[PDB]
Structures are given as structure tokens and as C-alpha cells.
What does this fold into?
Amino acid sequence: RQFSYLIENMARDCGEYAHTRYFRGGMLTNARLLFGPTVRLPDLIIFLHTLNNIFEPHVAVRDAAKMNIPTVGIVDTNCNPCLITYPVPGNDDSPLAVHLYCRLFQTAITRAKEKRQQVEALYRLQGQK
Amino acid sequence: SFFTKLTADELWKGALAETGAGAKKGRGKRTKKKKRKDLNRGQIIGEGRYGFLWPGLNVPLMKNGAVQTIAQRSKEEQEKVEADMIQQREEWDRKKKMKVKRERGWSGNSWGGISLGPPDPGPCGETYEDFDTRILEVRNVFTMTAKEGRKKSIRVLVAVGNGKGAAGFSIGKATDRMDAFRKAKNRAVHHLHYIERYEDHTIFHDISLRFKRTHIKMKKQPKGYGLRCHRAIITICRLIGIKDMYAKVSGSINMLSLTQGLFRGLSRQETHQQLADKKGLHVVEIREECGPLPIVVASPRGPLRKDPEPEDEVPDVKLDWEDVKTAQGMKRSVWSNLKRAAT
Amino acid sequence: PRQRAIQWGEDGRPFHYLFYTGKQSYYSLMHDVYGMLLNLEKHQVIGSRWLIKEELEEMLVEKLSDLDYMQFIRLLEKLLTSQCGAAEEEFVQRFRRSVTLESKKQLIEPVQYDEQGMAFSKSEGKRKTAKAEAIVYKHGSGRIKVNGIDYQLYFPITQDREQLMFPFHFVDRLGKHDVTCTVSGGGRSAQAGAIRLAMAKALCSFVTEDEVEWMRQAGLLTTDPRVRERKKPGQEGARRKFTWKKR
Amino acid sequence: SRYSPEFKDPLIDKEYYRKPVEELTEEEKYVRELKKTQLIKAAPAGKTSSVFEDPVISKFTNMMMIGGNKVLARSLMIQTLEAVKRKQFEKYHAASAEEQATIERNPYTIFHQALKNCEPMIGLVPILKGGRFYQVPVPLPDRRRRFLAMKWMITECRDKKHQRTLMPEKLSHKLLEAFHNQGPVIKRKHDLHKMAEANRALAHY
Amino acid sequence: KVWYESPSLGSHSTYKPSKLEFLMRSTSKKTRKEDHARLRALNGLLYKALTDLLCTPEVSQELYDLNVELSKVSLTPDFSACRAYWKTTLSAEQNAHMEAVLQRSAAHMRHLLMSQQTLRNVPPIVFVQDKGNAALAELDQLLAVADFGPRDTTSSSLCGIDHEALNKQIMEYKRRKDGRKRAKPRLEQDSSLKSYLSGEEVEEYECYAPD
Amino acid sequence: KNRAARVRVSKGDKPVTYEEAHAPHYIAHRKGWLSLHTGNLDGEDHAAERTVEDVFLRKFMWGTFPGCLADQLVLKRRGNQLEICAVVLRQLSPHKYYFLVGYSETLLSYFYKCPVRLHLQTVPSKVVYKYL
RNA sequence: GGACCUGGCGGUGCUUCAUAUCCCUCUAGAGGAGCCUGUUCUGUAAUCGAUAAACCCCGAUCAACCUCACCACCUCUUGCUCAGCCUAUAUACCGCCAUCUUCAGCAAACCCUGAUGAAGGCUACAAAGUAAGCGCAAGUACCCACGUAAAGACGUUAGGUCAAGGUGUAGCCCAUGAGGUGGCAAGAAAUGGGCUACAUUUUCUACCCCAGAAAACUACGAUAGCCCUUAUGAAACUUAAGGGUCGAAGGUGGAUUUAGC
Ligand SMILES: [K+]
Ligand SMILES: [K+]
Ligand SMILES: [K+]
Ligand SMILES: [K+]
Ligand SMILES: [K+]
Ligand SMILES: [K+]
Ligand SMILES: [Mg+2]
Ligand SMILES: [Mg+2]
Ligand SMILES: [Mg+2]
Ligand SMILES: [Mg+2]
Ligand SMILES: [Mg+2]
Ligand SMILES: [Mg+2]
Ligand SMILES: [Mg+2]
Ligand SMILES: [Mg+2]
Ligand SMILES: [Mg+2]
Ligand SMILES: [Mg+2]
Ligand SMILES: [Mg+2]
Ligand SMILES: [Mg+2]
Ligand SMILES: [Mg+2]
Ligand SMILES: [Mg+2]
Ligand SMILES: [Mg+2]
Ligand SMILES: [Mg+2]
Ligand SMILES: [Mg+2]
Ligand SMILES: [Mg+2]
Ligand SMILES: [Mg+2]
Ligand SMILES: [Mg+2]
It folds into this structure.
């Protein structure tokens, strides 16, 4: 919760999604019931902290694997990386570490979206002529 | 009295006695049961015993461009109508009596082995027509309850598979047996294992494992050997697509332990390509029917080792006394190698 | 009933960055309030109530728990205690619903004049099944007429007369007004109570505003709602049950 | 109750209202501005602002009332107060100038002192111990002391020992007896206190 | 672990006994198995803290001389109040002195208890009096003041039967004179499969002025 | 537990009409009366005869339009006119509904010696208020 | 036989509770007397059902004939009915209800944990639950937003009712059906509920609350007993009302127990 506000802003700024609140049972494994039969689930879940507030693995780590969602996760020395697809060993507590991660992911995500637009635009201009 | 008469629904609800202390706890059993019959089914508005022909109700209103008048069927003409309705009533009873018999399972009164069909189509236009469902266990579980005493629920174990390596199983629980079938078969389709098959007919190597107290020993077999395995394993193997295998179940014969013990062992089998990649050597198959011809079944994708595999003069592998006793002709059983139907 | 709009487009991407919380509107509000509290730090009752959960659940168009409601309110109070500016005040007032406080001040009857020009007021009172209508004259000698009879002849019971005395005595006006009242229904005590209420209401036209509030606080201007309760079937009375038979 | 909890009980006291504002404290000023916003119950028919109102006698009258017959209950009370006053005026005229100073002729002063002389300071409670009942002494609250004094006085006058004597003569005679620390009701007080002393050992319970 | 259970999944959770936590709690929530343990042990800690303050002269000279002994100390689960019990003395005169000093000390003691940062949030301590049967001394206070005034049907029930009523009853008469088997539930037979294996056979355009 | 005229909760598959879904205590609160006449007003006579006639007309129309009635009958009396308002299904051919209207109106007019009219409202299917 | 789970139970622990409520406290009662009425038992040729809480002025907002279903005698046989049966089974039922309920929970469809065991699924600075629907609630009725009604799910007691009516199953059909005449229903007793009393806060009269008399063997006290008249009816020692006569137990009721905010 020290970084809930920071993370939610980073998600909105990059045009992505954040879930920093209490994780209710079945958000991923029962999404069609909770959201609707046509709900689209995430294609990638990025964990800036892999543990919940009682020092157990975040339920979404297990449930992400169940739904065949790749997971990126910062894994500190007390975390379990077994089910994280792309683990990144690093400090998850220090404000400087977490701020760095948010800049890197925010920048990586924003750069890729602009690259996608550049290529598409070029591919269309060349297509007409 | 006309005013003491009731509707058909009221009369059947009373006569059937489906609500009551008899039907609450199944305190009453029904070898002979009153069956509801719709008595308005074959009845035509306007038709009565007297055989009157009312224009516009039971006969056409206009005949030859002129309005018909009130008429009455002759006594003989009415007997035919009455007889025809009785025959039509027995024909309807016989059409319902003619119901297609369904194939039995492992036994006549057993649920195990019976097909339940493909899982239901998912909400998002998902379909599973390629999958077949088989029942493995149907149990009556009795729960002691604080206020209602012993209640009866159903626990079902079903396995699903497409016959091409993809198979899974799930437990279903519900008060009704047919709701449990739906839960189990629909849930199992989301918990599918992929099982690798050698030449799409058998396992890649002998598999011997223990799950809890259930031991399962499986042997790779050649084509034409068939499925000589526990009837439950036979059922599961047809769903996976294994045609030739020997299996022996020892210890506790618990269906659930056997099912998940079987799926755990079949999902952790190393293929020949994995063996070649792990050891960086060729996998060469020697078949006695093909003589000394060496058949390379798998070659490593990465570099190929130059150092031969060490030849330990004597392997330190643990052997099964049952397998050894058989090879030495010291195994005597009247039940082994018995003639059985094709499986 | 108001219907929530689609929460994603054709490509399936949710519109709101908090979609996957399941409470995007609630958590978007908490996110906005938490952010304002931070900016203040970087920079540095009677007529209103907080909206109820059922009104918050409509501004957001979502379902909320009771603890969800509390956490949001605890966060707004934390925003008032700070040096909130104008921008931080229009926001809080969106969640303050004005609580209308009813006036308890007694309504004063008009002062009328008769053919002879004597000022008087008229009011009514009810006690049980008794209904009274009293005419209190501004000036008089203390005469009270009940259905044309002297009050001590109509009310031979001393307690019924003490009830007639109470309104005038409480404001120190014994022997200063003449009363002519009519009462019907009820018993002797109920009729005296109805006259007490009728006279007090009419007497309020001739006393100061502070005296009218003292009569109100003494229970002299409140209609007694205590009426006979119906008998219920299966029991001896309104409350008494039939004897629980010996077991 | 047909009154919602929002309804507050009425305060019937002329003095409380005429009290000047300056004498008021900041706490008493808040209570007065608060009641202007509160709902007030209608005053019961029993109590009024009359200067002759006595809440104790009104309570004694209700404890003597049988089946809602307040007229008879009130009649018996006023007949008792007249009987006490006449008995004292007869005792006064027949006495010497010295004794006259010690003779009380106010029936309200006699009534109150008669009851105060019957209030039991300590009482007993029946307790169960080992399948056996033993009474335990306990202090009595003020409400209970005043209740018992009235109940004992009314009970004694209703005793069948009195043959054909009207209630105003019985009650008036008992009040004047208790006024002088004499009578059966005073004995009931003395015995209750005496029984408490015996059961002091059991007071640990 | 020991027979005393310590398997709680949220063993790393930070115990937060405060008045604000009680308000921000699910109403459905009920105390868990090992939730009472922390309460039982936290109340014991308060007893330890209070006992040392009483016997150390530095806290207060008046308190030390009193030599007060705490009979019981149990906090409330609400987190609004704390119940502490001290043993009364024989002399009611002495009891007044102890209560008076304790009543005024409590306010300072609360601040002294805040010195222990672990228990910094200490609800106001309610120094109840018990262990000395204070009522019994209170009763004697009234007993001496109190004014005592001038000082000086059938044996049939015992038998256990109503022998008389029965004797009359016989006399009145004399006046006129002169199991099944229950099947095991698991073995109860069903026909659902036979009905299943027998078979289950329960078995558009619109026009104006049709013909 | 009270039983009178209460459709009991089931598994959510039982369609009930507005009338069937409201127990007796909702009569005059959420649902009206199925017959309107003056016999039950204070100072009015012949309540017994109107009641028997209503019981017959309900049974008569149930068996005269078998399987066609989609709801309870509403019986209205004005003067000596008797109006029967029925919600029926759209399964029977229109010729059969006209025959039964002519047949029922005439037979009932001679039976009770009053001008009787039958008003039919057709619905494609029974109107469902809720699924109990 | 081992281990575990559920339920039940514990002369099982702890904490908090019950608001007319388990105990004490408050008021009037019941338990004693007579009478009214129900039940039991006994009696009778002479119904039935309810019958611990949740039966006992209960089905009955009602039995002189009728009602009536009972007993005795006599009579009828396609029978008021395209017959009939108050015959058995409420442990086949519908219908309508009691009870906890002076409760707040039930629960389809999903999801997840326990290795996919029987089972379990809450933490708000939150840790796997989401939950339609039903109930509570809301709303409505009565004089308010109060109170009282009404409502009160699932389930528990194979609870009550085949004798409200209907009805499955079995049974009777010259009788287990139908009609007629007369008759039963008492009290040796026991017991539940109620009424009236034992009196002076009373009794009688006037009055409807400022009165006069009464007040212990001619008082208080029967709505009982006996006699007479009347009302209803075809029929009244019987049912009701009134009068006359009569003037009893009863002297404020042990253990125990009921109701009321
Ligand atoms: K247990
Ligand atoms: K009694
Ligand atoms: K039943
Ligand atoms: K029946
Ligand atoms: K039957
Ligand atoms: K009684
Ligand atoms: Mg860390
Ligand atoms: Mg067979
Ligand atoms: Mg009463
Ligand atoms: Mg009820
Ligand atoms: Mg008695
Ligand atoms: Mg019986
Ligand atoms: Mg029975
Ligand atoms: Mg019973
Ligand atoms: Mg007869
Ligand atoms: Mg008879
Ligand atoms: Mg018969
Ligand atoms: Mg039953
Ligand atoms: Mg209300
Ligand atoms: Mg009710
Ligand atoms: Mg409600
Ligand atoms: Mg039974
Ligand atoms: Mg017969
Ligand atoms: Mg008499
Ligand atoms: Mg006559
Ligand atoms: Mg006499």
C-alpha cells in the first residue's frame, strides 16, 4: 500500500491496468461470471510485489498460471519465483527500487505502443502508393 | 356434486404424493409408482359420446360453399370413432414403451464405463464434440446434518478425452446424480492433461509408480497386444488413445487414487526426443521382427556427443519380483493370460 | 432501472484502468481522494449530513459493502480536517446531502374578534376518543364553560379540574381569561385532557414566544398518542395471553 | 410505547424556566437550546405545576389504587390527610402551652416523616447454596427503600386483623404511630435489620 | 510447535489491538481459534506492566507506600476500556486512602504506560476494586448506622404417595362393588440406472389470414 | 407455516403469473379482486347467489376453453349485465374461439337470465411475472 | 481393527446473553371453596378426532328432535347421483395448519483449497470466494416515521386433520350402503381452564363521584338446589330469561404455577 497510488498512476499513464486493492476470490478463474461471458482477461500480469500483506504469495500468481497468463514479477529474497514466467530478482521494498521499476515498465510499454503506430502508419502509406 | 370437482393438476398432485414426509427422506420407495398422464392429450374440443358434429368446432364450418348444419354420427359411425381412439391410445402407450436400450457399463447395475457424451458447449460458442466422457465412479455420500439428519448426495468421478492424447478427470458433487454428471464432465474439460504416446498406440517406457497406497505398474507393449489393464484403466486409455498396454494395480484399489495416480504417471513420461536431447545421443530401436537393423527413433537437436555412454557391467536398477518370477517360469496363476473379449 | 454501459469496446480492451478491480468507480473515487490529500501536504454540520450508502451506490452505479462505505467516509473526514481549498470543497459537497431540520416552534393561532370586539383565539385538542374545541378570550375573570356548564359542575372530580388549571397556572395567568369550550366523546378524564390541550393551544396566542416554548417543553402542546390497543385473537387481551395450561 | 425514542420526557417546573439567563452555565445553556429541537411527550394527567403537588403522596396514592380506581384511591388519601390533621388538632387543644410546641399539625410533614421512619437501610435476598436456601444481607438502593416503606404501610392497613375499620382511620392511625417510631410497620423495619445482623456471616456470597 | 497450536497461516500478520480496528471489521467475522490467545496473552502483559509500577518507588512515593496488590487485570476485547482489580484492606478508613491515591494516580500511570512504546496505545484504565468483598465492608458501614430499635399438612407427601386420595378412590370403587428390521441406508436399492439403461424418451413461419 | 394460496419457492424454473405470485395478504394491497359486484357492500343483498354464480362461471369457462385460458377470469357485473374478461392463448383457430364465444354467451344468458358478454384477450404465451 | 470427518450427546469448559425474561425484583392471578365448562377414568345397548411443549370453552363463531357420523328395532336394493360408503391407511396425499419463529437463515449456478479423501472456503491497514432467487428488511393496513397487526423462507417433530371437501391404495355392494321410530350422553372420582366469592378500596338505594343506610348465624356469599311464570319450538323435569323460596361451602388459599413493559 506504500506504492498503491504510484502504481495506479503508472498504469493509467501508460494506458494499461492496475489492480492494487484486495484481490477477490476468482477475479481470473471466474471472470466470466464476475464480468460477463465476453470479458477479455489480461494477456500479461506484471507483479511489482509478489507477496500479499500476510507474506504469502499473491493469489494471482497461482491463478495467472491456471488461466495461462504469463507473469512478470519482481522477486525479492523472501519470494517464490517458481510460477513467475519472467522473474526479475530485485528489491521490492525501497521506494527508489519501486520507482525505478515503474519508470522502466512505463517507458518500455509506452515505447512499444508508439513503435506499433509508426510501423502501421508506414505500412499503410506505402500500401496506397 | 359439480362444485366438489377439481382441476387435473390438483388431482395429480394429490394422487402422485411427490411432496410429503414420504418423499422428503425417501421414506417411501417406488417399485410401483403412480405415473402422471395427460388426459387432455388426444382429446378434441367438441367431441363427445353422443357424436354430434358441431359446424365450426369439430367439423368444417362450410361444406360445398354452404354452411353445415347440426348433425349426429350414426351409432355404427360413432363406434368406429370410439374404437379408433382406444387404438390410438394403445399406440401412444406403445410408442412410449418402445425406448432405445442404452449399452451397459462394467456390469448391468454399474455406472462405471458408461458414456455421458461430449461436454456441454461453453458460453462463448465453445464446443467439445471431439471429446468423449466416461463415468468411473458413482457414489452415494451420506452427510449427518445438524437439523435434517442423514442427507443423501452424489459424488461422481468422470474422465474426458478426445482419443488423441488429451484427457482429464474431475469430481462432481450435487444432490442429484445428473447435476453431478454435468459438473464433473464440464469441469474435467478445463483440467486436461496431454499424454505422449509412442507411435500413437502405447506409452514410451514402462511406468511404475505409487500414489498414496495405490501402486500402478504399466508396461510398454507392441501393436496388437490390446489393453490388458484394470477395467478403469481400459476406460481411461480409450479416452487418451492408448491401444496397447499392460497394467497391474496393487495395494488399495481406490478409484480416485487410481485415476489421478494413472494421470500423474502418464503425464511424466519422457519421450525419445527428450532422452536424446538430455543425453545428446542417438536413440536406436532394435526390433526382433526387423532383425539386427538399427532404427534411429530420435536424434539430438543440439550437438552430438563423441564419448560413448559408460557401460556399467552390471546395472544397479531395482527389479520387480513379479516381473522376474514370470520370466523364470516360476509364476503360477490360473487367472493370468486368460482369454478375454477384445479390449 | 439505470443500466451500466459497456465496460469495453470491440477489441475487448476495458475503458477504465481499474476495470479488473470489479469496483472501478469506487476505487477511482478513492484514488482521486487519496491523491488530493497528498497534494495538500506538498502545499502545506448542523444543516448537512453525509450521503447514505444507498445514495453513494447510485452516484457510482455500483454495489458497495458497509465497510467500503465507511472507508470512503473516513477518507472524506480526513480531507475536511486539512486546509482544503475551494477545489477541495466543491468535491466534498458532492457527498454532503443537506439534512432538513424541522421547526419544533409551536404554530400560533390567529387572534379573532367577535361581534362585541373582544379578542379571542380558537383551537382544538384530542385525547383518546375525546375531541375538544376551546375558545379562549384575551381578557376575562377566569370563567370556564364546558358545554354551557361551569367547569366545577361539569368536572366534579378534582383531578379533572387540576388538568384545566395546569395550562393557565404554568404561565401565571389564573383569573385572566374566559373560556367557552365544547367536548364530546371519551370519558371524564379523557375529556379533561382534550380540553387541557385545546385551551393550551389557544392560550398560546396571548403569551410571549418564550412562554410558548416553555409550554411545549412542559408537555402542554403535544397531542397524547396513547390510545387503546386492539385485542388480538388467541389471547385474552391486547397483551395478556391465555393461561399456559398446566403441563 | 406509541412514543418514538425521539420523544423526551416533559420537565414540569415553573422555576426551571423563569431562571435568568445570566445565572445559567455554558452547560445549562446548551441543554436549553437543545430541547428547542427535541420532541416532548404530552404531560401525563397525574402531575401538574400546582404548588400543592407532592410526588410522594401521588405515588402512595397509585400504590393504593385497585383496578384503576384513582378517584377512590385519591379519596382515601385526602380522607387520611384530614384524619391525621384532626387527630393532631385534638391533641393540640388538649395539651399544655409547653407540650403544644412539640406537637406537629401538618399532615404532609407527618406523612413524610412516618415513611422515612420505616425505610429499611439494609435488606435480605434469598440465595441458593448446596440445594439449600439461605438469605443474604445486602444494602438497599434509595428507590427500593422508599418503595418498601410504602408497600409495608399499605400492606399493614390491608391486613384482615383490622375489623370493619375504614382505611382512612387505619392508615391515619399507622402514620401517627410510625411518626413516633412505634407500630407494626416500624417493627417490620427493625426485624429486617435484625435478621440482617444474624446473616452477616453469609454476606460473603 | 507444542500441543499449544501455532499453525496459523497469517502468523506473520502484525497484531493491531486498537479502537479503530474494531470499527473497521467485517460484522460476519468471528474470533479465530488462536485469536483469543493474543488477547489472553496481551491482558497478561498489562498485568505485568502495572505490577512493576506499584512496587517501584520512582513512579510515585504515595503509590509505593500504599503497597497495593493487583488481584486481576483483564483488558476488554472492544479496546475501549481496561479492567484492573486491586485487593481491598480490612480498614475501611485505609480503603479510602488507597482508592483516592489510585484514582488520581491512574491518570499519570496511563502516561507512564505510554512510555512503553509496545503498549503505547493503552485504553483508559478502569481501576475496579475486588478480591476484598468490598460490599461486605460496605454492608457493615450501614449495619452499624442502621436502627434496630429497642432490643428485647399430610404425611402422605412425606411418604411420597397421596395415600389418602388413593384410599378414597379404592373406597369409592368398593362402594360400587357392594421391533422391526431397518435396512442399511447404503444398501438401499435404486432403479435410476435401469431407467437410464432402459432408455430415456420423454419425447415457425407466420401469416396474416392463413390457410 | 402458512399455506393458503402461496406458490412455494423452488429451483427458479417455475414461471408464475402476477396473480399467483402474491399471497392473500397482498389482496387489496398489490393485487385487486377477480370479481366485482355489489353483493359484499354494506347494506347489499344476494352475496350468496353472486358467489355461487362466480364459482360456476369459472369452472364452466375452464372446461369450455380447455387449455386456452392463460390467467384467471375477471368477472364484472353492471346492472344486469355480466361481463366475463378472459386472457386466452393463440393456439386454437379463430373459428373455434368465435364458436365458443357465441356458444358460451348464449348458453350463459339463458342459464342466469341476464345479458352475458365474453371479452377475450389473446396472448402468444402465458405472461411470466417471475420465476420461483 | 487403525486413523479421520460429521451428527448426536456430555451430572462438558469459557465468554457474552435472555427484558415480561432463566433467577430475584413489580402487579394481578391459578393451586383451597361453590358453580360453569373440557378432559381422563368409570358407567352405558350407545360415536369420532385433538390428547408433553405444540391436547384439554380443542374441530364446535356451539349436540332437546334435527345436527348425527353412535345404539336398539323395523324397512328398502340400479338405490338424491351414468350409484353409494363419516369403511381401513394423515406412515400414499392434495388442501388448510401447529411448532421452533419472542428465529435469520436457505440456496440454484460457478469458482477455489485439501495431492482432485470424507470435507472446507473469514480476516477491511482484508488472507478465495462471487452469488441469482426466497426469507428477514423495505413497503403497506390501523391513529405517525412509534406501536400493534400482518408477514415470517428452507428445514425439524412420517406433528394435526381421509370426519371440510377432493383423492391414491385396499375393502364393502341384500350392506361396511340408504330410510324410519325411539334412545344414549351419567358421575364413585380425578384433573385443566374459566366464573362468582370470601367482603369495609366492602354491601343496598339514589346519583353517575360533596348523599343516606347496611355491616357476622335476618351480614358478605350460588349464575347451585327446589317451586312457579315467561320466551323459543310441533315437542322444554331438561334450553334461556325472570320471580319466589333457600342462605351452603367460602374467612384471601401448602409445594407449585400463569400473564403483563
Ligand atoms: K462433537
Ligand atoms: K386462588
Ligand atoms: K401434512
Ligand atoms: K379427506
Ligand atoms: K381415502
Ligand atoms: K381455575
Ligand atoms: Mg521485499
Ligand atoms: Mg443384470
Ligand atoms: Mg386484561
Ligand atoms: Mg401462525
Ligand atoms: Mg380451584
Ligand atoms: Mg385417539
Ligand atoms: Mg391421530
Ligand atoms: Mg404432541
Ligand atoms: Mg333420531
Ligand atoms: Mg340426537
Ligand atoms: Mg355409515
Ligand atoms: Mg403427518
Ligand atoms: Mg412501523
Ligand atoms: Mg402475528
Ligand atoms: Mg416484513
Ligand atoms: Mg403421525
Ligand atoms: Mg349401515
Ligand atoms: Mg338462583
Ligand atoms: Mg309454549
Ligand atoms: Mg344474606
